[PDB]
Design a protein around this ligand. Sequence first.
Ligand SMILES: *C/C=C(C)/C=C/C=C(C)/C=C/C1=C(C)CCCC1(C)C
Ligand SMILES: CCCCCCCC/C=C\CCCCCCCC(=O)O
Ligand SMILES: CCCCCCCC/C=C\CCCCCCCC(=O)O
Ligand SMILES: [Cl-]
Length: 262
Amino acid sequence: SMKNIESLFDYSAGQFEFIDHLLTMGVGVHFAALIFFLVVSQFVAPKYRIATALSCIVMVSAGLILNSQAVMWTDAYAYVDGSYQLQDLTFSNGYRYVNWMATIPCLLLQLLIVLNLKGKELFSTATWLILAAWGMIITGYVGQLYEVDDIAQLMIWGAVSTAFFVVMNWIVGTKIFKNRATMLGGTDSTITKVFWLMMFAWTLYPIAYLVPAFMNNADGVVLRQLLFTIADISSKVIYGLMITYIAIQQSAAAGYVPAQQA
Ligand SMILES: *C/C=C(C)/C=C/C=C(C)/C=C/C1=C(C)CCCC1(C)C
Ligand SMILES: CCCCCCCC/C=C\CCCCCCCC(=O)O
Ligand SMILES: CCCCCCCC/C=C\CCCCCCCC(=O)O
Ligand SMILES: [Cl-]
């Protein structure tokens, strides 16, 4: 709450409205995508259809937290004497962290679904990834509690966090490069692209996490939200658009009529 660097600075109108406009824009993008993921669920064979539902759940999950950040952002600061100054203790990024605990399993689970895992291997691989992801999120959460008070502790908890992250991506890549032969309609190619999109998009988060360490000012608060914004759109919206394209393609190849007509 009062432990993040946002509570340390006044913000010009340009900075403050630009952050607000980033968060509100993120609301309209996620809820717009929800409609798309929703309408296309009928062109998906029952095999992969849960991957699309998981996108919808992600769109609303991220959308409600962005909407909450937007409102909290406007409730915390008031334009006084030519700047926006903290009025209450309501804004913090810790609500992004508590969100990721939900959305990250969904993002991984729909990856395993289109990879065509099933049964024991779906349940086993899902458990380790979700436990490695949560370990990454919980040590990352504890680390940003100190982004103001203890920069050293932020580095340590970040290092513990990145161990989970690396173990997590290793497992992900291992299943992709061992199961892509199974995939239909040529998506063995597409899935390789998705994996790198993950590598890129998700790597932006630890960079946002480190902003207080190399850019401890108000334009670092703007840079961070701009980094988070690019990361969400790529890791949730674009990622799920590709998961969706893979679901339909494989559905059509496997003889699902609604898919083959779309
Ligand atoms: C939609 C949100 C997503 C996909 C969030 C992903 C978050 C991460 C990959 C966070 C990673 C972190 C580390 C690897 C170490 C530093 C602390 C974190 C949590 C920022
Ligand atoms: C840490 C708590 C447990 C986390 C592991 C989660 C395990 C994932 C289990 C199944 C997820 C949904 C399965 C959907 C597969 C589609 C097959 C079907 O439609 O019958
Ligand atoms: C559930 C039982 C234990 C689970 C282990 C969780 C993984 C934690 C890994 C190591 C984190 C240690 C970092 C300690 C912070 C040092 C800063 C301090 O002095 O408080
Ligand atoms: Cl999220």
